[PDB]
């Protein structure tokens, strides 16, 4: 089958809105989590978030921006970065063999709330004509494919925390089917109390670290108490290898493995069994040893351990270095898969492994695995794996191999 | 390349909640559209909908149903029907080589509204722990994969009106990649004023027929005035041919063509050009003449004609018989693609072409095309085509060939 590489990236996140800032914060171990006054004012129990600090209206053409909620807007800025990074020409961006596969976990709870408040107070006409494109499940793909004049595939995948990892794997598969040469893959996620309250109510979020927000997300720590919600966007340029070499592309990495499985077990907790099969499917096409695993690792009591049990079954006594970057970044939901793919690309480009932050007391149930608690500098980091596991028992695993 | 057939179906719709009732209403030309008092009470300008008449809480065990909104519930009941219809065994349904690809355009605006009303009036805990799975973009896949113990692929696609057509085509592609043998493909969509108001506010919906609701959806009629929103669910069993033959499956049709393209131009306005490329891509793998085209045909002034311009460019003087079944069913959004695939399968089983209803005066801009205004009985239907075109310039076309 045709080989597939990544030739450009872009990111909007609480760790930074450009690759150099994000790389630096991963290397230094600086969390992007902050206190969220709006959460406290609205009666949430979790008062922490990984929030993006941007004036989106000053960064995006108004004709484009009117159709967007924050999820699309974050993804759009990430895509602009990825296009610049990749050096693709307008004709390489806009042609039947170049596509877009990008999604979100939610869409825009804020625009939905505004629409209904408006209906009740002011009537239907005052809702305005832009709410469907901001709130539909395809908001991220629709709002990007249209202004970038994408002519190839155009759809969104939604698979909760697996969303943007499935997007990248499906971009690879569209190229392997022979249907596309270039696919923009990624995701976006709005961060607002109108979405975070739903997670608070199901008992998913951190609450015990509201006074020390930078410490709240602490995968593998004995005092972890739920995930820290986040927003943002990411996009990668997925490209067929011969196309990339012929145009003199920069090549970060080859996509060498991809798994997508289902637990068929519990709506909210991983089975561990599905994750084992997902990692094995990703590894079935990989000959090189795995140097680093970026876990799903959300800072939840059950989930962090269940995934580690699966890692132990897959690798036995030969596990790779492991960290969760969610201890720094929080959980960007639909954006988590592409964010973590990007973090892994930046680690390989920079020759370092980000440590698993905020571990005061390593959970004894994971202490036999090589959980990296500090940055590994001067790392010969060639082959990396990232897991993304969402509600509904949906699993995604990507394996990337550094291009020399 | 592996061949792909459809071996089971299920449907929840305003035309019926079983395939025999639906087939009868298609043949007789009986619309499912009714007056919606809640729309009028809430100040919408459109007072018509295609609504499902089911007591969902009597049909789905509460332990399953608590995680669902209506979109997932409709899809679940369609999947129960498709499982019975297919004759698959529990070991064939729950297997690493059996997957689920099913989505929605929205998810649950009703559950979002209830959650925020509850947060404001009663606080965060009273929202309850079920709202994320009801409202997340992957609600339809998550809420089915878990109880049916799906082990293979598991994710949603969201692409507006193309959603469940892309689900079917991607199910076909997973089988062609060699990754799955059976994939449940389809979609679901909630119908509620909290979603319909968004479409009303963009000027998309019919308003001139509120006193005569069954006449409101009237694709190609000179006095069409917008689409009629609907809800429901549909699911088809997409299966590798040798697997189907070995297990003695019933076989409706082979999937012989699939297109998926992007306009890369208008967020909402119909393109003509993207539709031409999508139909050509579907037809590139088809040698048989097309006997029938089920258009997207939403009963919009511009959209109906833009699509017919594309059909004229693709087929010229050899255009197939055409009808829009949306004049009967309304527009089920995320469920439209699988609903119309099912209607086409039922037309091939019954040897009839459903008439394009409610045409008092055929629009002169489409009158040169063979738009059937009445049901054709004793129709020799071997190869049928269905278009689904969504906001964001997303396009799908499926071509199905009757299995003799
Ligand atoms: Cl396990
Ligand atoms: Cl998660
Ligand atoms: Cl939609
Ligand atoms: Cl309470
Ligand atoms: Cl006629
Ligand atoms: Cl539409």
Residue numbers in the entry:
A (entry chain A), B (entry chain B): 1 to 404
Provide the authors' original text about this structure.
Background: FabB (3-oxoacyl-[acyl-carrier-protein] synthase 1) is part of the fatty acid synthesis II pathway found in bacteria and a potential target for antibiotics. The enzyme catalyses the Claisen condensation of malonyl-ACP (acyl carrier protein) with acyl-ACP via an acyl-enzyme intermediate. Cells lacking FabB are auxotroph for unsaturated fatty acids, making FabB an essential gene for the bacteria.
12 Here, we report the crystal structure of an intermediate-mimicking PaFabB variant at 1.3 Å resolution. Here, the catalytic residue Cys161 of PaFabB was mutated to Ala161. In the Ala variant, the presumably negatively charged Cys in the w. t. form is replaced with a neutral residue, thus mimicking more closely the charge of the lauryl intermediate. PaFabB C161A crystallized as a dimer and has the same overall fold as observed before for FabB and FabF from other organisms. The crystal was in the space group C 2 2 21 and contained 2 protein molecules in the asymmetric unit. The two catalytic histidines, His296 and His331, are highly conserved and well aligned with the catalytic histidines from both VcFabB and PaFabF. Due to the high concentration of ethylene glycol (20% v/v) and salt in the well and protein buffers, respectively (150 mM NaCl and 200 mM NaI), 18 ethylene glycol molecules and 11 ions (Cl - and I -) were identified and placed in the crystal structure of PaFabB C161A during refinement. Some of these molecules were found to bind in the active site of the protein. As can be seen from the crystal structure, Phe391 adopts the ‘open’ conformation as expected for an intermediate-mimicking FabB variant (dihedral angle C-CA-CB-CG = 170.2 o). The C161A mutation of FabB in this crystal structure causes Phe 391 to be in the ‘open’ conformation and allows targeting of the intermediate-acylated state of FabB; in a similar manner to the natural antibiotic platensimycin.
